[PDB]
Symmetry: C4
Subunit: 291 residues, 4 copies
């Protein structure tokens, strides 16, 4: 069967045809999703193709610019870069009314061009990534006398995330009395969804009790309903002093029945007590005697 | 009867005044509610008419501006545009004390002008709109063996909204023991008010059970209390990595009794599984045999 | 008796002696609490007394500045304003090493001076006031068969506040088994503390039931315990697209026993249905036949 | 035994790596954790060494810069500082194509340099610290006829913190039926975890009742499980009109059994009613008669 939700928690559902688009959305992804090196280019290019134009625009007025060359674009281009950046050496001042007036316009442009450039540079500086690692598998094993759906996540940074909240949601196809078959979401009660200070590792646990949406359920029954599990994480990072988000999705076949995450708090004294994320996806299992 | 609440959730009540108004409110709507093209004008005009004034202010000092023309506004205007944007080609330097002093003043003006012009450009850049679509009607039909008040909303963009919250509120006129008739608000319990990842479509449902404020009601009883329904949606948008929200209101005559929304996750394989918002306001109903 | 809490919800408690102070606190009240006109001054003054200094600093190097006058402060001052604002007409360029080097320093100054000026101008633009009016009195009258502590608040603006939360807290002196007398806070359950869309008026109500901290309490008993009531309001304003806060405090003698707020939704058709805040503090009472 | 949690709530666990690091994290601590005086250096240096380079880059083009000195770095350096800050006196204008081209580049650099320099100045300006003081010890004494775990915190500033939230968490080593020994976290219910207006002092209390994770425990049993207590405080600060938070941790040997904090609201009339934080860490204890 196909994955409804990818592993990164992204919907694999197709959307239908043209209809819609916004700007703070438009003027915001292509410009704030690409790596800085890319971003700088996207602005360096914009920066130059605006000058080059105002340069064309100048030369389009004649031999206006004072002390420049006749029709030389590599003389008007420079006048713009000196006019827009509000540098104005003076040695190349505008001439007449068309120029001067175009100036008041080019500089105003480089003004907002500074503002905009600044807004963006800040929107970006404020889209902190979570730095949260999710275990590659899930497991269902006994804990405190009950079968327990588990999974864990770790902080890949030395800065603390405070007020961390984890949501573990079951998503399967069900059918109602009205015989209607629908996709449904279930908020699995975790023995702890709020963690005051997320610093190192955290194992989220769902005790499968008579009150659980997956009570008396097996790998088979789960697959039948095309069961999937979504995990959303959020918290206030201390590093950026801002909010942070992270999600991941699991499939039925990513659940190791009988598994046990191996202890990551591997305290090896000879220097200090530590945490090892090298063992983070490690899962213990009991194998049964073949014949 | 009239609509207490408009379709977009805006109150249709009249307010009585001549009293009070603020500034971060004043200096914020007329300036941050209008489309960018409009916004640009509102600043392009403020830009020039301040220059134009400072030009008037210069000429008013006499034949001061060195290397300009006598009383020519079309020469002092350009000096301001050159002084404010802090360009200063030099060929038109100030003259004396009144000028220079006016300069240190004009330039400072264009300074904050940059600041202000920046704050704004940012405030705006951060008032994301939520592209949430609300269905034109509501429906009361059976779901899980119970009459259920339903309505739905869709994400008009490809970006995901994290931590979505919907509130469906009944607002009607009631009467207390003290014989007082008051407009009351009722928070209807939904079979689910928090959505982890609002990605495609969502049908909000209110099971009308013996605990419901509309239990045993009918279109007639609902109209009598002049019942209305308000819906508030909020969520963290991944596009702008910011918060977003939306509201909408419905009246009694917008509730199709017996209706069923038509499935939108119209999976037409031959390419992929999808979602169609063309069928979003589509409601199925049983028609009774005429005689 | 003295007011522990003023009417605006401010503590009237004295703090003891010197010890402590921060900067984002220092560099933040004196500069962001004063009215804009004041703010502009505080920056206009800073702006000038920095130039005037760099001017002194220049003249302190000798007859350096080119094309200026000997020892004339009203010639170096202007050089700074032309150097800091990064204008640089050129006609007065620096001279030697001390000057030029001082320049690289003055301009860098006017740089951060732009940044800082910008940060602040934005912090300010983002300290939205609530615009929430609290009724001057409180009342205790029957509602739905029970004695009910009430009070109301109104939105003094045409923009909606969404997700409004009101907290009504009783604060009195109590004594424990250990015979210890302490000041205590009580969260009074309101028949509704969360309001999805605060637009016009809202009457907060505390049903005094056997579960109430003021059950079987009288004006006298309340005064004895020096009872006070605090009300905190918060919500997401749509206007500034930011959070908003407002608080107020009431005394025992600001509670009208037997009172009834008068209806503010005074619907006078002949034009439309309205809201009148002129009647907001109006309270009805039944007077008893004197003899 | 060692402290799993430091006094300031920082984890004292070792992390194992050579793996991963980010940028809005990189370009954010070394740059936004250091005191302003330090911050100013970190930029004043970056400012000059970029200028100095562009100077080297110019001279590397030969005797280009018009009106300068042959191969003199102390002439091209000043040209950059004049080109970057977009000053451009003009007397030192670029020369040819390599220069001018380098200009449009340098100036653009000083542009973003302004942007970046601005974002940062703002990020910082918005990482408010909470001036919350935590008591050095905790105490378990009787309150309302029950052993109660207590601790307290004070506001070190005159600004009010709105919507204060405190979480007091027990963290100890426990063992499950499956014979697994795990470090568990316990959210102790406080007789009050949310404070409307955190203005002076606050004594957080945990009634040790039959429902408490430390019911029937003793200093010895607590030490055996290597019990620790973590406290997280958060709130909206009115000073910066922003959010703030603080954490602190206590170990078993920091719990005074039988202790009582001494009253801090030391009301000494002869001027006014106050609060003394000099007695904040003051704990009273009964001493048993020696023989
Ligand atoms: K300039
Ligand atoms: K010049
Ligand atoms: K400039
Ligand atoms: K210049
Ligand atoms: K010149």
């Amino acid at each position: 069967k196909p994955r409804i939700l990818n592993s990164d928690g992204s919907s694999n559902i197709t959307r239908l045809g043209l209809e819609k688009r916004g700007w703070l959305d438009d003027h915001y992804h292509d410009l704030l999703t690409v790596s800085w090196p890319v971003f700088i280019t996207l602005i360096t290019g914009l920066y130059l193709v605006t000058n080059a134009l105002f340069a064309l625009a100048y030369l389009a007025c004649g031999d206006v610019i004072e002390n420049a060359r006749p029709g030389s674009f590599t003389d008007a281009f420079f006048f713009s870069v000196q006019t827009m950046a509000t540098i104005g050496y003076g040695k190349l001042i505008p001439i007449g009314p068309l120029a001067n007036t175009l100036v008041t316009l080019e500089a105003l442009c480089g003004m907002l061009g500074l503002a905009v450039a600044a807004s963006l540079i800040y929107a970006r500086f404020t889209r902190p990534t979570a730095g949260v690692l999710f275990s590659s598998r899930m497991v269902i094993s006994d804990f405190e006398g009950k079968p327990t759906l588990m999974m864990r996540l770790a902080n890949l940074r030395i800065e603390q995330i405070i007020e961390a909240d984890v949501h573990l949601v079951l998503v399967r196809s069900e059918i109602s009395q009205e015989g209607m078959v629908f996709r449904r979401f279930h908020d699995l009660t975790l023995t702890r969804s709020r963690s005051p200070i997320f610093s190192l590792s955290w194992t989220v646990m769902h005790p499968i009790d008579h009150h659980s949406p997956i009570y008396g359920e097996t790998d088979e029954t789960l697959r039948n309903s095309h069961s999937e599990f979504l995990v959303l994480f959020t918290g206030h990072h201390e590093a950026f002093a801002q909010n942070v988000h992270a999600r991941h999705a699991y499939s039925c076949d990513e659940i190791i029945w009988g598994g046990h995450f191996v202890d990551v708090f591997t305290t090896l004294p000879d220097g200090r007590r530590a945490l090892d994320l090298g063992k983070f996806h490690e899962i213990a299992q009991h194998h049964h005697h073949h014949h």
